[PDB]
Design a protein around this ligand. Structure first.
Ligand SMILES: CS/C=C/C(=O)SCCNC(=O)CCNC(=O)[C@H](O)C(C)(C)COP(=O)(O)OP(=O)(O)OC[C@H]1O[C@@H](n2cnc3c(N)ncnc32)[C@H](O)[C@@H]1OP(=O)(O)O
Ligand SMILES: CS/C=C/C(=O)SCCNC(=O)CCNC(=O)[C@H](O)C(C)(C)COP(=O)(O)OP(=O)(O)OC[C@H]1O[C@@H](n2cnc3c(N)ncnc32)[C@H](O)[C@@H]1OP(=O)(O)O
Ligand SMILES: CS/C=C/C(=O)SCCNC(=O)CCNC(=O)[C@H](O)C(C)(C)COP(=O)(O)OP(=O)(O)OC[C@H]1O[C@@H](n2cnc3c(N)ncnc32)[C@H](O)[C@@H]1OP(=O)(O)O
Ligand SMILES: CS/C=C/C(=O)SCCNC(=O)CCNC(=O)[C@H](O)C(C)(C)COP(=O)(O)OP(=O)(O)OC[C@H]1O[C@@H](n2cnc3c(N)ncnc32)[C@H](O)[C@@H]1OP(=O)(O)O
Ligand SMILES: CS/C=C/C(=O)SCCNC(=O)CCNC(=O)[C@H](O)C(C)(C)COP(=O)(O)OP(=O)(O)OC[C@H]1O[C@@H](n2cnc3c(N)ncnc32)[C@H](O)[C@@H]1OP(=O)(O)O
Ligand SMILES: CS/C=C/C(=O)SCCNC(=O)CCNC(=O)[C@H](O)C(C)(C)COP(=O)(O)OP(=O)(O)OC[C@H]1O[C@@H](n2cnc3c(N)ncnc32)[C@H](O)[C@@H]1OP(=O)(O)O
Lengths: 266, 266, 266, 251, 251, 251
């Protein structure tokens, strides 16, 4: 009742009765820049969310901008050595890898700037919902530096290796329907991206926990290997998930016609 | 004259004089659901199609719907153990991997529902032709289960890892021009997808057998490795294919101007 | 002052004062077909461009067509053995791999035909700028042969494995906005693709050399491995690039508000 | 007859506990592997698991396990590069079905295990050699690059650089030195066939699924980054270790 | 207390030079690894680097290093396939943090290093065995497929085919033969604990960053094509070899 | 002069059968590898195949093969992390051209084969050691992480965990123990140079293409999943095994 949401500071957490937890970056006056303290909180939260029973996460940023990326001021002031910063990057990965492979569905509800490490963070979620104020960029080059948080991997998977290279090499900005179509977000709304993210999250939370776990962890792992080896692994995932007792009621519903068929959109 | 098309039951096969074989899933009253028997026939057919001389395959489903996926009723009734079903999934892979890496051009002529394992099957073909009635989905989650047939691999290659995840996580349906543009099918027609698939197949069958074999097997293998190692392999594929005696007539046609040049579309 | 641009023949080279070097395929009467001599010049140029101080490359073709691909006449006449041609393909890779992983930003300014090995060459650049006369194809099958220059890898990364297969299997041609949207080029202009490429190149040359080097070499390498291992490598790239002394002035500019913020497009 | 009939170049003997002895049977040609024999290996190893075979003891009739690819057939066929590339894919189909098929294969070696014969031996999970057994890739000296995935499997057995040494120089290994190198896990002073049968009978008394996973998943996981193989392994362990037959054995 | 308190199944002793002795402490159950012990290993190895631990000497209390996965707990829990798949992921979390965590781990082995116990030992960078130490994956005979990534790490240690042999037959290795096979880099006639401490003290006197790279980057690079690992290595070398502390040592 | 001139730190001797002796020639500095020497290795190994070199015997002038990276130059240059990362990429360019270049390289070792010197030796296909030869990665003790892809190649030669042991502890190997470990395929009681020449002359008498494939494809296939390497191998076999020169040899 407070076990999941207590003890944090840079993050604000709200656990709903159906197991959907709203995780809000809460440093709006700094445009939710990710400093080392905030990254450690993300590591802590995503390291235990699955075992804590969280069914889905709606990730958002307080204020008008999702996330401005690496806290550039903390970085500049720290005057870090290469090894000091390499270690900081490894902490980002511990958090973001836990998000991607952890097994808990994450839906990012975007607004305003989703830039640099902020796009890296949005990319670590399974689904992204953008609104009319949302824009994307990897402006790192302007600051004289490289990106991080696995953006070189995830954004390449989202929009194509060559478009990812274009974004960081030129600082090109994308927004609106063009951004959605490019692959920066699966959903675009005329209204509240938060409300749309909550709708998706609630539906996800009503599905089977094991099935969601597999979807949210196995697919990313299988992209990392040869498709011929991935197929063998997929068969074992299917073996466990498809024979689970909890799905028999749904299988029976299909056989007795009480369950809905798959129809084209209206 | 009957060697290629005899001995089957769930599949109907029609071998045309130019070596194009039409393979039709033939359980329309069950919406061509893939039960274990049907999968074994696909294993048998694609395991020997290249050596039998088949030049191209037009894969289609009898009735109004291409394929409804895993036979859910057989699955539910069998009340399978995890290992029993893992083994069933391996049979699906034997068939679908033979389709993808086998070297025989496969063009799927889609109509209606292309869902779950049915999309997995369509994804195992090189080319997909959709019509105005065609719609796509990975509704597995609704049934409480995971997908199979390598859909996590192939559909991710077709539309992007994150869109593949979106489809199975949310049950999102795609159709029409939007589906084509997303990458679910390379061709969309206002008319008969079968006639369009046959047109593509006939043109393919008129090209060189070795060249088609390489195109239909080597490209998928090269995506499975580092691009630096793939390049070395590509050079050996090019070495064998590009120096084949059968292509010299075409090379000569280009040199003497009797062959057509590459021009923009009209 | 002539060290970078002297000693070539099939290539014309022009080094601008800001370190941008214009590399022009110069066999317009042969539509810039890539024969073995031209490939060796590309090997020589891209093998040393980074150490020579070249900041960006604008790659283009003299005449109305970017590049017609493999010199088919030289190939036909040579009546090569499989090993002879496999060796020729390895020379293409030495050049194109040096382009992709070499660390020097390359922007291709396309016009007319970008076909077969010509698309392979355009694909080896980081950015592609197309104009209204530009069209793309992998017509190799028509000539009875396979593609090369890593097109099976790079074009698959650009437009999707299945669209790459479609292009070579059917000889399908793409042009205009449709080509740009498919992923064949990140930029499309109503005017001069060369002028647009120069604008991009000049901006790129004004960024930090180490940062550009990382962007132009590390991202391609990281796509070749599992994302979990790639993340560790990304942290070391970030460690070196993000703590470089040359970027502190830019970081300071952001902290004191003298640097521009990231805003949506107008 | 369902398991043993249908082969001309292979001799099969199915034992009552499910161990099937598969004997290469062209002793007059030292069991050289021609396209027809390769196709029989494709057929046998594609169906053995589903036909109920619990383990296979693979041996060569005569004093020599296998003299390699049939060079007489190769020379007579005068194959083009593409014709031979296709022949190589058939060799891989047979050997891949052996390695990833899930049916434990124990090779009982004797005499020459050379060229494609070493590729065949390497496709088994276990190898038992005797005091007459020797290994080599002699074809390199005559301009041939060994096929059957020997470059893949022998590198895993003895190390990439020792594999390069064998094909580049034709170096021969035998006796205890070969066993210690990694060419065979078992070396006997007596019958390699009898030792292989001892191993096969014990393996056949274990659970079908457990042997299936051991004989297919490990090879697949070795092709992956260890960080992704870990995840796949959890699902393999999840299915194998909670099977009812295993619980009974714990009890 | 910041480093040593917080564990029930592990006994910890932090030495003044930063070497931390981590002792598996359920001697009465031969240090069988139950879910609770695995979670403690996850916690310790997730934080050791940031807590300042310079090297770890891992040992088992009693005469036996580790008897493997706790089969008593497994049998009693009567786990479903998904329940056990989740347990396996926890084992991987602990062992992956050990292998890629960047803190040098030296295992001081004694007696039985079996099943999941061999998986644990393999997760260390270095292993020191004594004259009583033996290695085996006996669980296969009772229908169990070894977890903890043993199929991954033991294949790197002794070769894929020797690893397949161990799990398929339950074959036991000990003494000099085991060391030569690759099961342990060091074998002693005396105390394996004292030899491990000697190794750990020397390692602890080296630079933190250099040890960190050695103990995380090599495993990551082995998961890549050598052509891409080369590029990553250049950046590792770039950071490690230009550190101020290293320059001082050159001088 | 086309093959042998153009180098200052290397001494070259092209024999009539195409074997080229490449001698590291800074004996006064124990052949330490400075940036200039590395660039010469890049040049030689980038062109050897196309210049017609049939095989290379690589040795170090003096009693020691190679003392490693030139630490004097490193200390004086006071390199930044990016400066040194770039130096590392040059080392990889040279060693990658050696490993995948397709020209057989046989290293004749003597004395110290240490640090970057072991990385260089590992870049050859074959290594011949004598009774004075020893191997070590001593730089780790002074805070340096070995470059030149030693973590990649030495892991393939002796196993990832033995490679980690060498860099983490500075452990030295020599004599028969080093050969058995996998540091060298050949050990001689006499001249390692003469034994390397014997090997090189035999290799040079084989077909150019066959040696080219052996010396480039095997390393590339080891970077792939075995299931995809199989397919690539079929095309390598298709081209190599149907060459006219090979047919003649069969006949
Ligand atoms: C693991 S490697 C990762 C590499 C990276 O991620 S590099 C980071 C790339 N990101 C950027 O370049 C985005 C920088 N920020 C902006 O462009 C703007 O602040 C945005 C468009 C996000 C919002 O514009 P606004 O006009 O609404 O706000 P600003 O006036 O620019 O900033 C408001 C406050 O947020 C702070 N802030 C705004 N991004 C800040 C920030 N990334 N850091 C550290 N303080 C920030 C900014 O400094 C200021 O602090 P303060 O009032 O105390 O001086
Ligand atoms: C390797 S892991 C793979 C995982 C999967 O692939 S999971 C499968 C996901 N697929 C689905 O959820 C699609 C289920 N089917 C439907 O939604 C509809 O049947 C569709 C849209 C395909 C067609 O709708 P229709 O209204 O035209 O037909 P239905 O009335 O729903 O079904 C007609 C007959 O086909 C049967 N059928 C229709 N899909 C059937 C089916 N997937 N199985 C087994 N009988 C089926 C359905 O049960 C019924 O049988 P019968 O008249 O004897 O009771
Ligand atoms: C590593 S594996 C790689 C595999 C490949 O890359 S296969 C190559 C696939 N490319 C093609 O099939 C394109 C062939 N060329 C054309 O289709 C046209 O020439 C294009 C559309 C580029 C231009 O059409 P044009 O009507 O403007 O020119 P043409 O009259 O067709 O050709 C003009 C000159 O360029 C020559 N040329 C035009 N492509 C030539 C060419 N690819 N070779 C060798 N001479 C050429 C053509 O032969 C002729 O030479 P010449 O006047 O001395 O006879
Ligand atoms: C996937 S790429 C792989 C490439 C390769 O494997 S190339 C081949 C590699 N193998 C060899 O080079 C082994 C060559 N043969 C031998 O070493 C001997 O035959 C061995 C040691 C196995 C047995 O010696 P024997 O003195 O007991 O018998 P031979 O007199 O040498 O051979 C007896 C018969 O077997 C035949 N044979 C013996 N290897 C034959 C063969 N690889 N082919 C095709 N007929 C053969 C040989 O031709 C002869 O046929 P015939 O009675 O009609 O004259
Ligand atoms: C990631 S998948 C991995 C799969 C596995 O690892 S499966 C297990 C593999 N390991 C084994 O099969 C080793 C089995 N045990 C032994 O071989 C012996 O216990 C050894 C040689 C280690 C020590 O022999 P001892 O004669 O000195 O002691 P035991 O009398 O055999 O065992 C003493 C106590 O430890 C317990 N124990 C001893 N292994 C126990 C155990 N793996 N679990 C759970 N209680 C155990 C054993 O049950 C008993 O508990 P208790 O006093 O309550 O009866
Ligand atoms: C890709 S990252 C790789 C990292 C590394 O490789 S770091 C270096 C690893 N190698 C070593 O630590 C070996 C250090 N040297 C030795 O062990 C000895 O020199 C050996 C055993 C090779 C020969 O001993 P000697 O007693 O016969 O000769 P020395 O008196 O030790 O050295 C003779 C000359 O070679 C020089 N030298 C000897 N290694 C030199 C060197 N690695 N650099 C730069 N000058 C050197 C040494 O400085 C000296 O120069 P000088 O006459 O001007 O004083």
């Amino acid at each position: 009742t407070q076990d999941v949401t207590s003890g944090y500071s840079n993050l604000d957490l709200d656990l709903r009765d159906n197991g959907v937890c709203v995780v809000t970056l809460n440093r709006p006056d700094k445009r939710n820049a990710l400093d080392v303290a905030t990254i450690e909180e993300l590591v802590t939260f995503f390291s235990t969310a699955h075992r804590k029973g969280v069914r889905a996460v709606v990730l958002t940023g307080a204020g008008d901008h999702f996330c401005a990326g690496l806290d550039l001021v903390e970085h500049w002031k720290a005057d870090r050595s290469a090894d000091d910063f390499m270690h900081v990057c490894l902490r980002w990965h511990e958090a973001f890898n836990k998000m991607e492979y952890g097994g808990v569905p994450i839906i990012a509800a975007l607004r305003g700037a989703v830039v640099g490490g902020g796009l890296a963070l949005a990319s670590a979620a399974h689904l992204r919902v953008m609104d009319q104020s949302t824009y994307f960029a990897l402006p790192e080059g302007q600051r004289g530096i490289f990106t991080g948080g696995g953006a070189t991997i995830r954004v390449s998977d989202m929009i194509g290796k060559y478009r990812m290279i274009d974004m960081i090499l030129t600082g090109r900005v994308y927004q609106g329907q063009e951004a959605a179509d490019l692959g920066l977000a699966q959903y675009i709304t005329e209204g509240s991206s938060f409300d749309k993210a909550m709708e998706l999250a609630d539906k996800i939370a009503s599905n089977l926990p094991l099935t969601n776990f597999a979807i949210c962890s196995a697919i990313s792992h299988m992209q990392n290997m040869s498709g011929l080896d991935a197929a063998y692994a997929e068969a074992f995932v299917g073996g466990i998930v498809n024979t689970q007792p909890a799905a028999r009621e749904r299988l029976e519903a299909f056989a007795n016609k009480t369950a809905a068929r798959v129809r084209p959109n209206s």
